[PDB]
Design a protein around this ligand. Structure first.
Ligand SMILES: *[C@@H]1O[C@H](CO)[C@@H](O[C@@H]2O[C@H](CO)[C@@H](O[C@@H]3O[C@H](CO[C@H]4O[C@H](CO[C@H]5O[C@H](CO)[C@@H](O)[C@H](O)[C@@H]5O[C@H]5O[C@H](CO)[C@@H](O)[C@H](O)[C@@H]5O)[C@@H](O)[C@H](O[C@H]5O[C@H](CO)[C@@H](O)[C@H](O)[C@@H]5O)[C@@H]4O)[C@@H](O)[C@H](O[C@H]4O[C@H](CO)[C@@H](O)[C@H](O)[C@@H]4O[C@H]4O[C@H](CO)[C@@H](O)[C@H](O)[C@@H]4O[C@H]4O[C@H](CO)[C@@H](O)[C@H](O)[C@@H]4O)[C@@H]3O)[C@H](O)[C@H]2NC(C)=O)[C@H](O)[C@H]1NC(C)=O
Ligand SMILES: *[C@@H]1O[C@H](CO)[C@@H](O[C@@H]2O[C@H](CO)[C@@H](O[C@@H]3O[C@H](CO[C@H]4O[C@H](CO[C@H]5O[C@H](CO)[C@@H](O)[C@H](O)[C@@H]5O[C@H]5O[C@H](CO)[C@@H](O)[C@H](O)[C@@H]5O)[C@@H](O)[C@H](O[C@H]5O[C@H](CO)[C@@H](O)[C@H](O)[C@@H]5O)[C@@H]4O)[C@@H](O)[C@H](O[C@H]4O[C@H](CO)[C@@H](O)[C@H](O)[C@@H]4O[C@H]4O[C@H](CO)[C@@H](O)[C@H](O)[C@@H]4O[C@H]4O[C@H](CO)[C@@H](O)[C@H](O)[C@@H]4O)[C@@H]3O)[C@H](O)[C@H]2NC(C)=O)[C@H](O)[C@H]1NC(C)=O
Ligand SMILES: *[C@@H]1O[C@H](CO)[C@@H](O[C@@H]2O[C@H](CO)[C@@H](O[C@@H]3O[C@H](CO[C@H]4O[C@H](CO)[C@@H](O)[C@H](O[C@H]5O[C@H](CO)[C@@H](O)[C@H](O)[C@@H]5O)[C@@H]4O)[C@@H](O)[C@H](O[C@H]4O[C@H](CO)[C@@H](O)[C@H](O)[C@@H]4O[C@H]4O[C@H](CO)[C@@H](O)[C@H](O)[C@@H]4O)[C@@H]3O)[C@H](O)[C@H]2NC(C)=O)[C@H](O)[C@H]1NC(C)=O
Ligand SMILES: *[C@@H]1O[C@H](CO)[C@@H](O[C@@H]2O[C@H](CO)[C@@H](O[C@@H]3O[C@H](CO[C@H]4O[C@H](CO)[C@@H](O)[C@H](O[C@H]5O[C@H](CO)[C@@H](O)[C@H](O)[C@@H]5O)[C@@H]4O)[C@@H](O)[C@H](O[C@H]4O[C@H](CO)[C@@H](O)[C@H](O)[C@@H]4O[C@H]4O[C@H](CO)[C@@H](O)[C@H](O)[C@@H]4O)[C@@H]3O)[C@H](O)[C@H]2NC(C)=O)[C@H](O)[C@H]1NC(C)=O
Ligand SMILES: *[C@@H]1O[C@H](CO)[C@@H](O[C@@H]2O[C@H](CO)[C@@H](O)[C@H](O)[C@H]2NC(C)=O)[C@H](O)[C@H]1NC(C)=O
Ligand SMILES: *[C@@H]1O[C@H](CO)[C@@H](O)[C@H](O)[C@H]1NC(C)=O
Ligand SMILES: *[C@@H]1O[C@H](CO)[C@@H](O)[C@H](O)[C@H]1NC(C)=O
Ligand SMILES: *[C@@H]1O[C@H](CO)[C@@H](O)[C@H](O)[C@H]1NC(C)=O
Ligand SMILES: *[C@@H]1O[C@H](CO)[C@@H](O)[C@H](O)[C@H]1NC(C)=O
Ligand SMILES: *[C@@H]1O[C@H](CO)[C@@H](O)[C@H](O)[C@H]1NC(C)=O
Ligand SMILES: *[C@@H]1O[C@H](CO)[C@@H](O)[C@H](O)[C@H]1NC(C)=O
Ligand SMILES: *[C@@H]1O[C@H](CO)[C@@H](O)[C@H](O)[C@H]1NC(C)=O
Ligand SMILES: *[C@@H]1O[C@H](CO)[C@@H](O)[C@H](O)[C@H]1NC(C)=O
Ligand SMILES: *[C@@H]1O[C@H](CO)[C@@H](O)[C@H](O)[C@H]1NC(C)=O
Ligand SMILES: *[C@@H]1O[C@H](CO)[C@@H](O)[C@H](O)[C@H]1NC(C)=O
Ligand SMILES: *[C@@H]1O[C@H](CO)[C@@H](O)[C@H](O)[C@H]1NC(C)=O
Ligand SMILES: *[C@@H]1O[C@H](CO)[C@@H](O)[C@H](O)[C@H]1NC(C)=O
Ligand SMILES: *[C@@H]1O[C@H](CO)[C@@H](O)[C@H](O)[C@H]1NC(C)=O
Ligand SMILES: OC[C@H]1O[C@](O)(CO)[C@@H](O)[C@@H]1O
Ligand SMILES: OC[C@H]1O[C@](O)(CO)[C@@H](O)[C@@H]1O
Lengths: 624, 624
């Protein structure tokens, strides 16, 4: 195994375990110390203002199994410190008959058992488990644990009647899934249900959704309400909150609802961030975020979606969330988005970016799999003075429109997402910042124009505002992780409304994915404007490429160039002419970002292990 | 619920949990503090000379489940002290994917991992488990744990390749069972295999048997040998040690071999006790003790058996234990006998006495189920100068015969069992001892004759020597736990060779078992004698009646009389006449015995719990 990155890669499958640990590894984001990670979980702001982040974790392995909560904390979403206890960085693990098959996703009751932060999580036991299998009741249940030391450790309630698991009865038969309890307070839902509490007897101040579906009949989000305030054992099933059809799609801008939901959450937002009103704020909108499975031919059959909803109260004292419009939270290789409340009326969302090595060819050589996305503030994005001639505006696909009184302008509303400002400030302050001169891409533009200042490594950010003619057929964007022989091209094509990431040349290593990523982006044209603008921001972090457009569209992907000099960046131009000009301004490069794990050495591998021949006998985990 | 024991019992099923805790409870023997217990396990003599005894335990329940090792220690087999740790009196419990379904029986390697006492135990996981079910490989495996604090706690080896479980591959297909590893040293087997170690490469000083069988083709005891001395991960399968046929019986004196073995062990004995020679001691005999299942219509389909064996070395470097003669370790409501070595060339055996409430009618009201037998020294019983006219002598059923040179006398050899002398000494010393006058049972004998001194409670022992004519048709024995209305009759009938316990009047409470117990007893007639003698000893301990005859035959049973005065005892006589006289001598009553758990209060119930609706969903444990 040669690690010479000045020549073509050899047969890297001959390399030992974790020999490629640092080669492609993100440095500026949340990632486990080593091994397998997937979904964020147990997210909460602690009493001291710091953020506790959990994650689905399988240390010393590179496939899923014995799934546990790994955890860490941060005062700024950006620089993190691992917990370190008797199980290393794990804080909850399989240990009881009810959760021995895995401690799945869970969420936080901030004032729970004996006043302590309390997690409600999916406790899994034996049996077929999956949306395409014949799962039975008991295999997935919901259980409680609480922490007396701010997340350093958790104490589970005892196993038994009136204790764990606390939710085990399936609310409907033939479920495709029954997991990922999302606990939340909602003045909105309390106000809506206040006249029906005699029907259900559920009067608690916490609600919980559980994600699943029904075999042959689409996904379901099930709503529960805490039966009594200050008591956490009894949760009353109200009814289905979200019901979608088997592989139903709301359209091209909205992914596909698949057969089963995962990691669903409920929030309420206004233009500033989180909204805690009862319905009285006319600018606030109710949202559900959710993953779907088996409604996609690629991306591990997974869509991370969101929908704006209008709540209706049913006669039996339950809530129907009627979908008003429906979108995509991230168009790339990410899934399992979780959101949580943060001080200052914020709702912050973070997901999991998987690798692009689906045949598991170099996973052992990495010695790890997975990272988080960046942490994102959610809010209601409002665009005023939108021109009615904006193409496709009244499809109202992943947005709503409200006409002005005179019908000559429109107010557009949709889900906004932006990187938390703490991370942007820390990144900028720790980076070498180059402000670049604006450029007109015209007849003289090369296909690729390197920036006047170049990155020094695979840890950087770039931004630019691309101004297009209203009838342009030109394409423009950014090339990143670029040498002569390897590069990744991020294009926007206003005529098709497609943002693409072309990865045919991303790496000389052929075992990594090289399919083109695609997001839809609606450029809302402004009344009186003779152009339309795309604000495009890209974070490059080891192998992660994380793209944001107009504080609305997000696309996370992976590129694994071998060569040490495949770090360059610049502007892309196609079909720009003297008449069809793309103006690029507000150009800036941040080289370096932040070391997100300052206490960790460069190599935190502890080696990899095999579970042995019993892994195949039990049939639960791959075993490596 | 009335607890008035001076009048007839009411409907005792209306009584609360553990309200009958003290009513029928043994006081003078090993028993858990509360709840369910079954098989002894993890038996060893510690470095300080004390005895560590483990047991299959389910606290706060009255049926089997979450099965764990409860433990205690004693300096004299008789007075015990519970361990007390983070899990109360438990010291090993289900905690890993490989043992989450139960920590089954295991045995001790005295100098094991890092020189510490080490247990090899059956670690169970999910799936059908049972001799009549379709069990699969992995459901029962064998795992190691070691203790650094003399049994107060145990540390399991890690889960994985080259660690736990250490034995998982089935040695043959379609096993009925694969459990109860019995680890032992054997100079005998080492000497027999010494010329074959090139064939197998197994040269360790520990052997282990695993108990099971093959579907449709009878029971099997599988022999393993430690691959290398001082190393405890690798155990090499040699071959089947004992092979018996599907529901095969060696005859009337030998029970039935059933379909599957449980709790099998291997030992070597001589007339004094344990034998540690290599084969050179011509007085020593190799024995296997084992439980069988599904070869009996009653007694929970369970026979606790033993066999004398002659070892043959196979060409593949394995051992066939050929059965020479075959007997019964206890004829009553006991099972799961374990034996272990004790200083002074002793092998000590102890089993589990189950209740006689198979429909679980009063188990909750008890608040516990089960006890141990007394601890028994094993040895080779030798009877010299036996008359060849002893009826049925040359059937050689559960004994062997060796003729004298002149053919006029016989030496009989069989398995001897007697209560450990420490217990007999402690019982006698703490009791009020009444030595009773000898009696001739003749034409004037009443059916029942109370002893001149009577017990004061349900904790006593009695012994007597019954001398019969060689052609007697008289019956005699002992009545115990007796008032006018309730009593239990222990009869010997030399003409049929049957020792019986008639329990039709044992209790006014009709839900307890009342079937007649039966053991075969061979009175070996001595050359020149004009009579034959039965030495009969009975221990009465709460509800336990434990009977020993001629240091050979054992019969454990249960009687639950309601009335407070159903404690009396005396002699039974049937068909005694002027011509057919039974002489009774050596009569002695010990009233009181010993408080075996001096630190425990009278009521050690902690209440009972229900596992809740998930117990039925998981399908592993009853849940109560
Ligand atoms: C199969 O069998 C299994 C084994 O038996 C079984 O699992 C066990 O289940 C039981 C029962 O559910 C569990 O017992 C509970 O334990 C809770 C604490 O759990 C944490 O701590 C224990 C013990 O920790 C000590 O020991 C360990 C090991 O040595 C050390 O590491 C620790 O440092 C600590 O050591 C100190 O103490 C020792 C003595 O105990 C000393 O020896 C030592 O020197 C130290 O000083 C840990 O073992 C636990 O770890 C395990 O679990 C975690 C997850 O939780 C895993 O991550 C980990 O790997 C382990 O598996 C864990 O860390 C107790 O809190 C709990 O007791 C409460 O609940 C019951 C009711 O259900 C009450 O009876 C009891 O009174 C307690 O309730 C009171 O207190 C709580 C909290 O304060 C209140 O909320 C509650 O209202 C109540 O308050 C009352 O009192 C107040 C005043 O005090 C009053 O104001 C109130 O009004 C009120 O009256 C219970 O004991 C046990 O942990 C399980 N063990 C394991 C190993 O899993 C399994 O379920 C079985 N399976 C089946 C299918 O049946
Ligand atoms: C799913 O995930 C699960 C969770 O991750 C996973 O289970 C875990 O598996 C791991 C890996 O197998 C287990 O880790 C092992 O733990 C052994 C010790 O186990 C005992 O102690 C721990 C820790 O105890 C501390 O913390 C608890 C909890 O707070 C306290 O109660 C204790 O008092 C104690 O507290 C002190 O220390 C803390 C810090 O650690 C402090 O915070 C605290 O303040 C105190 O000071 C317990 O948690 C264990 O309890 C659990 O298990 C028992 C059964 O064992 C249950 O009954 C119980 O309920 C719990 O479930 C337990 O009591 C370690 O010995 C072991 O490390 C050895 O092995 C590995 C190799 O496999 C080596 O890397 C390592 O070096 C060690 O080997 C050396 O040492 C041994 C023994 O000394 C030697 O034999 C060996 O040769 C070697 O020697 C070397 O060094 C010598 C010099 O030192 C040298 O001379 C030699 O030459 C040689 O080089 C390992 O860490 C972990 O316990 C499991 N945890 C649980 C909760 O189950 C599960 O498997 C996963 N499932 C799947 C399917 O994957
Ligand atoms: C004395 O000890 C016991 C422990 O043994 C303590 O706990 C009780 O344990 C018994 C079992 O011994 C439980 O009985 C079972 O109850 C089931 C129905 O439960 C619901 O109703 C009761 C009655 O009002 C409620 O109290 C329960 O509430 C508790 O549980 C819920 C969770 O569901 C918690 O949220 C609460 O907080 C409580 O903890 C429940 O709401 C019932 O299904 C079950 O029925 C079987 O058994 C009976 C009798 O044999 C049959 O009539 C019936 O047909 C079922 O029989 C089954 O038999 C076989 C084998 O099981 C199966 O193959 C068959 O198909 C069939 O299903 C049973 O009655 C009791 O619920 C439980 N009580 C608790 C936890 O409070 C006592 O508390 C303790 N007493 C004291 C004072 O300490
Ligand atoms: C680098 O990290 C790894 C952890 O990932 C460490 O451990 C190794 O892990 C790999 C898996 O990643 C193990 O590979 C598997 O080995 C099986 C055969 O094992 C036996 O042979 C090897 C080779 O000589 C021995 O080393 C083993 O000894 C160890 O295990 C025994 C217990 O059996 C212990 O007692 C010892 O002490 C050792 O610990 C064994 O004797 C093999 O069956 C398995 O095969 C699958 O995978 C390969 C490749 O994909 C296929 O060719 C094959 O067809 C099988 O594919 C399966 O694929 C799917 C999904 O699994 C199934 O559905 C199919 O039906 C099919 O079965 C695999 O090759 C390796 O054994 C293990 N090594 C150990 C523990 O030593 C490394 O140690 C670590 N390296 C370092 C230097 O630290
Ligand atoms: C019944 O018990 C008696 C008394 O223990 C046994 O007779 C004794 O046997 C020993 C050992 O051979 C002798 O040393 C004693 O002299 C005998 N004592 C007597 C006759 O009082 C007798 O062997 C036992 N019988 C059976 C059939 O087990
Ligand atoms: C980058 O590295 C490759 C391989 O060493 C080399 O061919 C190329 O000229 C280097 N320089 C660039 C792309 O500027
Ligand atoms: C990282 O550390 C692991 C564990 O010690 C080691 O096996 C591996 O070779 C190291 N990799 C690198 C790139 O240093
Ligand atoms: C309430 O009504 C809805 C709509 O029919 C139904 O799906 C839900 O199950 C009901 N809730 C109950 C029965 O608790
Ligand atoms: C909204 O405005 C557009 C453009 O003027 C018009 O076509 C449409 O009918 C208006 N909708 C409503 C509800 O008035
Ligand atoms: C660099 O990043 C750290 C960690 O996030 C942050 O606290 C610090 O303020 C940053 N440095 C600046 C802004 O100069
Ligand atoms: C075309 O673009 C280049 C580079 O921005 C610029 O120098 C030139 O002035 C542009 N042409 C016109 C006509 O503006
Ligand atoms: C024993 O008790 C019962 C019921 O109280 C009584 O009838 C009998 O006379 C008592 N005395 C005996 C059997 O000596
Ligand atoms: C024994 O103690 C248990 C637990 O406190 C109690 O429920 C039961 O009534 C007691 N039984 C007796 C006979 O004292
Ligand atoms: C050794 O031979 C016996 C008799 O055929 C057989 O049952 C056993 O499995 C053999 N041992 C092996 C193959 O290890
Ligand atoms: C043993 O002795 C009996 C009685 O004398 C006789 O019938 C039998 O044949 C003898 N057995 C042998 C092997 O000599
Ligand atoms: C009573 O029993 C205890 C406990 O077994 C024992 O140590 C003691 O010696 C006995 N008392 C005597 C023989 O007087
Ligand atoms: C018959 O038995 C009684 C009681 O033991 C005794 O008094 C009497 O002497 C016996 N008869 C003969 C003839 O020995
Ligand atoms: C003695 O026991 C046997 C069972 O081994 C039985 O067949 C026989 O009928 C019994 N006879 C008497 C008289 O009890
Ligand atoms: O690791 C298991 C967890 O990951 C998910 O499948 C999302 O991909 C969740 O539904 C589950 O809780
Ligand atoms: O409790 C389970 C244990 O009990 C037995 O079944 C004996 O009755 C053993 O074979 C097993 O190890």
């Amino acid at each position: 195994c040669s690690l010479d990155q000045t020549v073509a890669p050899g047969n890297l499958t001959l390399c030992g375990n974790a020999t490629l640990f640092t080669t492609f590894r993100p440095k500026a984001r949340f990632i486990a110390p080593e091994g397998w990670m997937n979904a964020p979980m147990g997210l909460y702001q602690r009493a001291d203002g710091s953020i506790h982040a959990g994650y689905q974790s399988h240390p010393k392995h590179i496939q899923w199994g014995n799934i546990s909560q790994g955890a860490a904390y941060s005062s700024d979403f950006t620089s993190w410190t691992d917990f370190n206890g008797s199980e290393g960085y794990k804080t909850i693990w399989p240990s009881q008959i009810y959760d021995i098959r895995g401690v799945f996703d869970g969420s936080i009751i901030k004032e729970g058992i004996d006043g302590y932060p309390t997690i409600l999580y999916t406790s899994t036991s034996f049996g077929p488990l999956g949306a395409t299998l014949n799962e039975a009741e008991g295999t997935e249940t919901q259980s409680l644990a609480y922490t007396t030391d701010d997340g350093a450790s958790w104490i589970k309630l005892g196993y038994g009647a009136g204790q764990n698991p606390v939710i085990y009865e399936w609310p409907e038969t033939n479920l495709t899934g029954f997991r990922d309890p999302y606990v939340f307070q909602s003045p909105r839902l309390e106000a809506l249900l206040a006249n029906t509490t005699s029907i259900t007897n559920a009067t608690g101040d916490h609600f919980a959704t559980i994600s699943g579906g029904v075999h042959g009949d689409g996904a379901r989000l099930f709503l529960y309400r805490q039966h009594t305030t200050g008591e956490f054992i009894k949760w009353t099933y109200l009814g289905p909150l979200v019901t979608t059809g088997y592989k139903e799609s709301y359209g091209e801008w909205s992914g596909n609802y698949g057969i089963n939901f995962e990691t669903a959450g409920v929030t309420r937002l206004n233009p500033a961030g989180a909204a805690w009103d009862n319905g009285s704020d006319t600018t606030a909108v109710d949202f559900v975020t959710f993953g779907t499975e088996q409604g996609r031919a690629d991306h591990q059959n997974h869509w991370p979606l969101w929908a704006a909803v209008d709540y209706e109260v049913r006669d039996n004292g339950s809530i129907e969330a009627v979908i008003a419009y429906s979108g995509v939270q991230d168009w790339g290789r990410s899934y399992a988005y979780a959101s949580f409340p943060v001080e200052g009326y914020r709702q912050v969302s973070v997901g999991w970016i998987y690798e692009d090595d689906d045949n598991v060819i170099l996973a052992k050589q990495f010695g790890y799999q997975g990272a988080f996305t960046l942490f994102r503030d959610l809010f209601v994005k409002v665009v005023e003075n939108v021109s009615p001639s904006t193409p496709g505006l009244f499809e109202q696909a992943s947005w709503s429109t409200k006409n002005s009184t005179d019908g000559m302008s429109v107010t557009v509303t949709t889900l906004g997402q932006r990187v938390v400002p703490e991370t942007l400030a820390a990144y900028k302050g720790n980076s070498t910042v180059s402000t670049l001169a604006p450029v007109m891409l015209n007849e003289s533009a090369a296909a690729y124009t390197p920036f006047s200042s170049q990155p020094t490594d695979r840890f950087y950010a770039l931004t630019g505002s691309f101004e297009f003619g209203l009838n342009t057929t030109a394409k423009a964007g950014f090339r990143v992780l670029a040498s002569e022989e390897e590069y990744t091209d991020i294009w926007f094509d206003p005529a098709s409304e497609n943002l693409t990431v072309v990865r045919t040349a991303s790496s000389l290593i052929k075992s990594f994915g090289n399919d083109t990523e695609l997001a839809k982006v609606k450029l809302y044209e402004i009344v009186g404007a003779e152009s339309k603008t795309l604000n495009l921001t890209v974070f490059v972090d080891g192998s992660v490429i994380e793209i944001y457009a107009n504080d609305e569209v997000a696309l996370s992907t992976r590129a694994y160039p071998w060569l040490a000099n495949s770090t360059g960046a610049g502007l892309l131009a196609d079909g720009t002419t003297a008449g069809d000009v793309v103006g690029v301004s507000g150009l800036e490069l941040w080289d370096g970002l932040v070391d997100a794990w300052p206490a960790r050495p460069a190599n935190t591998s502890q080696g990899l292990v095999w579970d042995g021949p019993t892994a195949a006998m039990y049939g639960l985990f791959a075993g490596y």
